[PDB]
Amino acid sequence: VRIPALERGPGLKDLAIFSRQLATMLGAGLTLLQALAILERQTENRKFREILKQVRTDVEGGMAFSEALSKHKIFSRLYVNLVRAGETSGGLDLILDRLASFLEKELELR
């Protein structure tokens, strides 16, 4: 039996909450790394928490945010591609706000 396969991983809800949190902190003026350190402490799903600690570690080491995300299935191609556009435009706050709103509405539908 593959025990890890049995563990509840991040859901739509988990991703929506994460995205809103980050949106909120980036919009308020916190840096990406400041926001991630706060988020990695306030994430409910253990597997998502482990994911986000790895993302923050990667970024703190100098890897791009979009590439750190791209390591993890929970982030779709469009999500990563949009985040990638944000890195180069200095509009991550706007990108994350729109992704979060999209996800929140997907959530309440489902």
Q: Please, what are the domains in the chain?
A: 1-110 (1.20.81.30)
Task: Tell me which amino acid residue 60 is.
Answer: E
Please name the residue that has the structure tokens 């591609």.
81
Q: How was this structure determined?
A: X-ray
Q: How many Cβ atoms sit within 10 Å of the Cβ of residue 99? A: 24
Q: Is 62 left (phi over 0), alpha (psi -120 to 50) or beta?
A: left
Distant-in-sequence, close-in-space partners of 41: CB < 8 Å, separation ≥ 6: none
User: How large is the greatest C-alpha to C-alpha distance in the chain, in angstroms?
Assistant: 46
Which two three-digit tokens encode residue 33? Answer: 């790394």
- Contact criterion met (CB below 8 Å) for 69 and 79: yes
- Residue 5 carries which DSSP code? G
Rounded to whole angstroms, what are the CA distances from 12 to 29, 58, 73, 79, 81?
26, 23, 12, 13, 18
